[PDB]
Design a protein around this ligand. Structure first.
Ligand SMILES: Cc1ncc(COP(=O)(O)O)c(C=O)c1O
Ligand SMILES: Cc1ncc(COP(=O)(O)O)c(C=O)c1O
Lengths: 426, 426
């Protein structure tokens, strides 16, 4: 006799829930390789030194860092800081009045508002995902578009034979053969889950196709800093497209690079072609678009969260803190690279069988970003969880290298050797 | 030739934009009476002493108060804090497993998720708004339901003739005449914008209608602590409805009572009737409902923001800080009352003509919450802004009493006298 009787239990999120099951596990040798969240040498969360300093500043002056509603698009200093990190200082696009920027709720919140923005303005534009992508891209898409009314489309990313390589000849054909003015979701770098990226050369081949077809590039940029360790370099494809006049959106998260996961801080940008006929007309169009983004947000969560905005704007606008921040990101990247070499060496030492035709583990060494798409099967993943207390993502056997430490790499290598010995690859 | 060419400008929010305009205004006698945001004796943002203490606690240990992704429903201590404040300590509803709680992005984000929760679960249920309500409710509603495909209905709230009294006879007819199992949006206390509330006696009359018709009550509760100045009393309607077995949702904001406006911290509750057959089955239903809310959120902004959650939980679970918090909220209510008296005295001393049949300003004294629904006309509001740099909400001449001070009340009264003498009431 309840109106809620029979309400269905939704399974927990296949990635986020791993941390929950992990925290609950009482095995002292447990290892968390699930969610892409940085961990230090001891396997623990890490506050970036630049963020620790920012906290000291903003927690010391609550008159200045007060708790009132922010401007609807975000604090100007935060928006300038965001543009600076993504597009560079005083970029061409900014000078020309082409960037429409609006604070949102980290990457996911920027995707949600960015997807809706496009679905409202261009309801007949086809929306293309790479054939492998972050699973939550599907959910965010569904709530905005409704997969049943407006199915997403796909472009070729990894080879259909399984091997960890972009089938780029087919990528190009798919983007070329798509209808003009379609939207293409791209990871800016450190493609998640595959760890395989377009090279510079390949992005350059995409460029003229995007131009001829007048396609919109939608970049998801959550790992700026984690591909090459260099901010500038990791924005290559975004800045190249913009400079060439490709029209773009960017969903920019600061969860991973600033380690501000729970603060829920990021920025959505739209960069138009700059062809309105004057700088002032470009700015008017940019402002119009920010006004549309803020109206959307107004009806969803009113306006965005200040604490993470304060942290980012304080760091980027202080010359000392900004350099510390760059160095902190370089340090995380370097530890991840260390764990790649160490896990690999421990697997090689054991002559552990691997996936694919080659049957090797060299892909651990060459993956870009936080993860390796290991190739371990669903059976391997369950076994590693149940017998060894090692938590991987089931799909693709995605491994977060940040959970590895000098103390546990050989333990992880041993568990894998056991898993693959007891259930060989087909 | 841009794909964004012709994108329309959306006008600024009519309430939030008042702070933007007020901030740009160079007139040193400017008065902000727009957004309902507490201000102290000097007209400045006020960090609650309880919040100041909480900040020092959480800013001092960033390992304990880390920046990792929170649990998808929110920290258990926060959820417990939120339930305690709304329903009481170890409520009968909690003991029976009837409460499903999920952190959300303050009031607005709680309404969004709660509106969508019901529209997904009970798509055929009619949704009823009071005939006067918070403007953003219409927009929150439009994004979930689509105003044009699925219009909201209304129940009678204020009298046809414009006078500040609820036409309670028609309120009951309207709720009695609606199809059974309809959804009614209610303000828990301090109805915004009118400042006129159902009395305890009126709420008790609505109870049997709600039971008989098996309606769902959706409570918007942002002002607990600002109506009667007592948390317990301000949750009367919610607690009475739940104790009687009315199934409710509550969208609970900590923007105003904790002064955490910009942190974006609130909680969504669904309280089912607890007829699943056991406490465990009640809890299983509640958890399933939480699982749906968190799936919604996953697709929208992933999970909610930690900083405000930390402040609230730290306050509520420390006996000294909770008492300090309660004292702090009383101090805010007390200042508002003193400003009601001072502004009313300053109008009365000038024999300033008032709106309505009575033509008096007494409704300044009796309004509940932060506002007075003044009845100044849109011509008056525009005149007060242009000639006196006083910022009010155009709709109903809603005035935020929180912007008044000992220094500026007489100025506001002189200005109102001028506006009303030049532009007499029809
Ligand atoms: C590729 C990608 N996009 C978006 C996100 C969104 O994460 P968040 O909402 O914390 O920014 C993530 C990380 O989870 C990601 O890896
Ligand atoms: C009547 C009413 N409902 C809901 C809200 C929610 O505001 P917020 O999103 O800051 O919690 C408020 C605040 O403006 C309010 O006054």
């Amino acid at each position: 006799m309840s109106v809620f009787s029979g309400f269905p239990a939704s399974p927990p999120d296949a990635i986020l829930n791993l941390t929950v099951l992990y925290n609950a596990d009482t095995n002292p040798k447990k290892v968390n390789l699930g969610v892409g969240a940085y961990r230090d040498e001891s396997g623990k969360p890490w506050i970036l030194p630049a963020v620790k300093e920012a906290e000291a500043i903003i927690s010391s002056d609550l008159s200045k860092y007060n708790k009132e509603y922010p401007p609807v698009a975000g604090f100007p200093l935060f928006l300038e800081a965001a543009q600076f990190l993504m597009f560079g200082k005083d970029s061409k696009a900014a000078q020309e009045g082409r960037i429409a920027s609006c604070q949102s709720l980290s990457g996911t919140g920027s995707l949600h508002i960015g997807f809706e923005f496009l679905h409202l303005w261009m309801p007949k534009a086809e929306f293309y995902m790479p054939s492998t992508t972050w699973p939550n891209h599907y959910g965010i898409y569904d709530k905005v578009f409704n997969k049943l009314k407006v199915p997403y489309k796909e472009y070729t990313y990894l080879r259909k034979d399984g091997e960890l390589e972009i089938d780029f000849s087919n990528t190009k054909k798919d983007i070329q053969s798509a209808p003009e003015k379609s939207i293409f979701l791209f990871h800016a770098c450190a493609h998640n889950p595959s760890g395989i990226d377009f090279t510079e050369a390949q992005w350059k081949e995409l460029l003229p196709i995007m131009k001829e077809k007048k396609h919109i590039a939608f970049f998801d940029s959550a790992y700026q800093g984690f591909a090459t360790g260099s901010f500038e370099a990791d924005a290559f494809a975004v800045r190249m497209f913009v400079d060439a006049g490709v029209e773009v959106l960017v969903a920019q998260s600061f969860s991973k690079n600033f380690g501000l996961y729970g603060e829920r801080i990021g920025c959505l940008h739209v960069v138009h072609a700059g062809v309105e006929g004057s700088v002032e007309k470009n700015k008017a169009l940019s402002a119009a678009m920010v006004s549309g983004m803020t109206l959307q947000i107004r009806k969803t969560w009113s306006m965005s969260a200040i604490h993470g905005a304060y942290i980012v704007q304080v760091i980027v606008h202080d010359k000392r803190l900004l350099q510390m921040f760059y160095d902190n990101v370089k340090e995380m990247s370097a530890r991840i690279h260390r764990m790649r070499s160490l896990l690999h060496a421990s697997l090689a030492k054991r002559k552990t069988p691997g996936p694919g035709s080659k049957g090797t583990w060299d892909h651990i060494l060459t993956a870009i970003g936080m993860f390796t798409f290991t190739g371990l099967t669903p059976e391997h993943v369950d076994y590693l969880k149940e017998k060894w207390s090692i938590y991987l993502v089931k799909a693709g056997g995605r491994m977060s290298m940040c959970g590895l430490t000098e103390s546990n790499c050989d333990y992880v290598a041993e568990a894998i050797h056991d898993a693959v010995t007891k259930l060989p690859f087909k």
